[PDB]
């Protein structure tokens, strides 16, 4: 919990240290939708 | 509102004991000379039809034998177990000659095509597999049921494959694509047994909700038989139209196929040394003569009923 948050903060500090100074075939959750299932439309939906 | 016909009732005339496990399935030799019971003692026991003597007993399934069928045109025994295996047995050497392996979970039922001679096996991994008999290869894998498929019917008419599963749906399959074409969600409970009429191009489905009669090939919903609303594990129909519905509470309910009129409600007894919970019907099957009824009870007994031949229409009236 708190130790995991402190480890994440230390990893973020190491990340900014490495940025100041691959992805191993992962799935980038923030960059796009992890799996896309589009909603169906019918008799409506000119969207926004 | 038609007046229903009078099928005569039935009476119990022999009870066979001797299994140390639950009598899971009953198959009859197609020449009606003997029958065979696959038990939960992992025993495939050939019994005499007339004398009732134990002809033979075989082992080999490491888990519970769920299904036993003997081929009507080949001298082969196809026994599916819960050990994710199906054994093909040559009865001339009385040996397992062929092995069907590839289901990821325990196989609960099997069926054969009467003319194409192809195997379909419904299992606990929510799938059935369609195997060539000789080469033991699953040339198809039917999927689409979300729950484990309780039973499968393989008929020569259209559609060939009728799968009843525990996700309250019935799937009716086009065989040549291996794809489901009709799906019936109308049962509120788990579809555990289905029975086909051999001539009327119709079938019925037993569930804890109700019994539902349909019609091939689109699955058009003919009738809803209320009553016998327990967990109907097994079903059979006569050439007369005598429908026997057997549930896991040990009661037999007997009906007309056409009108759906329940003409008989008989609860059988149990073994002397047995619990009251040990009354549950795993396989009801007519003989090839359509004269004797074999019920596979959960107190490790086989109860065979005869027709109540002394019955008349005024001693046993047809209600409404």
């Amino acid at each position: 919990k708190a130790r995991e948050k402190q480890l994440e903060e230390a990893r973020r500090l190491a990340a900014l240290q490495k940025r100041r100074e691959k992805r191993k075939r992962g799935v980038d959750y923030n960059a796009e939708i992890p799996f896309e299932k589009k909603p169906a439309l019918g008799f409506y939906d000119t969207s926004e | 509102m038609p007046k229903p016909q009078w099928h005569p009732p039935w009476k119990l005339y022999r009870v066979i004991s001797g299994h140390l496990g639950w009598v899971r399935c009953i198959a009859v030799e197609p020449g009606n000379q003997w029958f065979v019971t696959g038990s939960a003692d992992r025993t495939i026991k050939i019994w005499d039809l007339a004398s009732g003597k134990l002809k033979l007993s075989l082992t080999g399934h490491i888990s519970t034998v769920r299904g036993v069928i003997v081929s009507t045109r080949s001298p082969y025994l196809f026994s599916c177990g819960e050990d994710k295996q199906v054994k093909c047995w040559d009865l001339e050497y009385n040996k397992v000659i062929r092995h069907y392996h590839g289901h990821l979970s325990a196989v609960y039922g099997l069926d054969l095509h009467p003319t194409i001679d192809v195997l379909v096996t419904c299992s606990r991994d929510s799938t059935a597999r369609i195997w060539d008999v000789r080469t033991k290869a699953s040339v198809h894998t039917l999927s689409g049921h979300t729950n484990a498929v309780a039973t499968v019917r393989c008929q020569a008419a259209e559609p060939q494959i009728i799968t009843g599963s525990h996700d309250t749906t019935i799937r009716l399959w086009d065989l040549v694509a291996g794809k489901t074409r009709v799906t019936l969600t109308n049962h509120k409970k788990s579809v555990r047994a289905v029975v086909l009429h051999p001539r009327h191009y119709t079938f019925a489905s037993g569930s804890p909700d109700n019994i539902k009669q349909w019609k091939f090939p689109d699955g058009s919903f003919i009738q809803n038989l209320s009553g016998h609303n327990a967990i109907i594990n097994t079903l059979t129909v006569n050439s007369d139209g005598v429908l026997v519905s057997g549930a896991d509470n040990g009661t037999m309910h007997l009906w007309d196929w056409r009108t759906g009129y329940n003409f008989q409600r008989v609860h059988a007894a149990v073994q002397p040394g047995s619990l009251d919970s040990e009354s549950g019907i795993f396989a009801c099957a007519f003989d090839q003569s359509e004269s004797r009824l074999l019920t596979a009870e959960a107190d490790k007994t086989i109860k065979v009923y005869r027709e109540d031949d002394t019955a008349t229409e005024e001693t046993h009236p047809v209600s409404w």
Partner: protein, 295 residues
């Protein structure tokens, strides 16, 4: 856990006229599962052949499912309807399709659309065919119609780049000196050209398409009367009236042979601006090349 994309095992590669070549009498080779797709990595059907004489022995790059997705060439990776990059066509018509960048989601979505095409007819550039019919708005000012063979021209002899091709003219690679490596047009990432993202050829053709005033016109100070130079007496008032009858009513259709001016003016200002944008060095009225300006 038993999921995979199926293999592109099919004939009929959908190719450009440019990579297709000039010979009607074509000898052909086909590998079944020789290579994999360059984008979705399915094992696809390789089509290798010789279109002409001075050749690369050209062959297909990506799978037929990816080509069915994007309507581009299997070799040239440019759009089959116009000869343009898919970045140019997506900027012209619709750029809301895109593709996921992660490999697992890309393969899963590729399996989903592969199942969709397998349940579909088979010869269709997916969903935006219904919105891609509105073409020749501006992209056909620079869309190719000629079969371009200088991109089918074979690769450069790197041995004679080093000056050491002892074969000379026996070497089938090109004995001409290469292009500029510092030129960003020489970079050409294949995944970028597929995705329609920052392709330098597409940016160069967009920069070129920003140069011509093919639909600018409007040199008249809030006046519908636009004078089309280059018309002369060949373009009369009847051609301008027939052009403005589709846009509505013609307020002033006239021809002046002194200034060679086709004076076109619709009744509506928007219709007059649309007619001037059509005739601003992009339309011909009665066989006369019109170029819209102030009138």
């Amino acid at each position: 856990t038993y999921n995979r994309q199926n293999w592109e095992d099919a004939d009929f590669p959908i190719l450009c006229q440019t990579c297709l070549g000039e010979n009607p009498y074509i000898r052909m080779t086909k590998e079944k599962y020789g290579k994999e797709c360059k984008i979705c990595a399915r094992p696809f059907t390789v089509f290798r052949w010789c279109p002409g004489v001075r050749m690369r022995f050209k062959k297909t790059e990506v799978c037929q499912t990816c080509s069915k997705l994007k309507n581009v060439c299997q070799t040239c990776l440019l759009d089959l309807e116009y000869g343009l990059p898919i970045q140019v066509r997506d900027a012209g018509l619709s750029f809301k399709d895109d593709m996921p960048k992660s490999d697992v989601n890309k393969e899963y979505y590729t399996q989903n659309m592969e199942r969709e095409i397998s349940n579909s007819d088979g010869t269709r550039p997916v969903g935006m065919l219904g919105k891609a019919t509105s073409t020749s708005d501006m992209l056909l000012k620079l869309a190719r119609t000629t079969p371009y063979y200088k991109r089918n021209r074979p690769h450069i002899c790197s041995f004679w780049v080093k000056g050491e091709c002892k074969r000379g003219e026996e070497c089938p690679y090109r004995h001409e000196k290469p292009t500029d490596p510092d030129d960003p047009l020489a970079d050409q990432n294949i995944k970028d050209r597929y995705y329609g993202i920052n392709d330098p050829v597409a940016d160069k053709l967009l920069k070129r398409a920003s140069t011509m005033p093919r639909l600018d016109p409007p040199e008249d100070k809030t006046i519908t009367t636009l004078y089309v130079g280059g018309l002369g007496d060949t373009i009369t008032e009847t051609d301008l009236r027939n052009h403005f009858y589709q846009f509505g009513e013609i307020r002033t259709i006239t021809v002046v042979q002194r200034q060679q001016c086709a004076f076109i003016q619709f009744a509506t200002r928007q219709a007059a601006e649309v007619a001037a944008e059509k005739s601003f060095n992009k339309l011909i009225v009665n066989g006369r090349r019109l170029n819209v300006k102030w009138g």
